[PDB]
Design a protein around this nucleic acid. Structure first.
Lengths: 85, 85
DNA sequence: CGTGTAAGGAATTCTGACACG
DNA sequence: CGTGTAAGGAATTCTGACACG
């Protein structure tokens, strides 16, 4: 849970965990699909929940959904999550 | 659980999480107190369980226990863990 | 014993560009 | 649209040494 949301992995490990390239991972963030934190030196840090978020994103893109559509879906899920709490 | 044991953090994040220097973290490993994995390029990777292991180590060292004594205690705990499973 | 620092080398990540389309 | 690559710069980690004790 806390382990799941703590931003502690750099992009290289995420790449290995998701099978996504750095290009893809940074692009999804650029498309406001996820929000990694940044060390004070500019290095992006991801949590396990981010990794899972990235895999769901990749799956949707596989089924032919544009990032914009994915952003809408993600927004609903995020809102929904705030409800179950 | 799986999140807890997956080796995914590099030493910089561990330092920030434990408050230990790189010197201390690498030394404890050298004293066979923990076993981080290594990327194929030589970079040590730690899991959340490692981070907690490191904090317990630091606490024992605080109470004046030598690394050798800590290694014995850790060995028992590891053996005990294999029992509760 | 345990931990601090200086020192160069290797590896990682960063951004913006060029490319295809 | 989404993703690949080349390109230099900044930041990270690595090991072994010197230091105190």
């Amino acid at each position: 849970a806390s382990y799941r949301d703590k931003k502690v992995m750099s992009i290289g490990i995420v790449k290995e965990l998701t099978g996504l390239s750095e290009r893809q991972i940074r692009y999804y963030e650029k498309r406001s699909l996820l929000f990694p934190d940044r060390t004070n030196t500019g290095i992006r840090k991801y949590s396990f929940s981010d990794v899972e978020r990235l895999m769901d994103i990749a799956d949707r893109i596989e089924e032919g959904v544009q990032t914009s559509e994915i952003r809408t879906e993600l927004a609903k899920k995020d809102e929904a999550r705030k409800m179950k709490e």
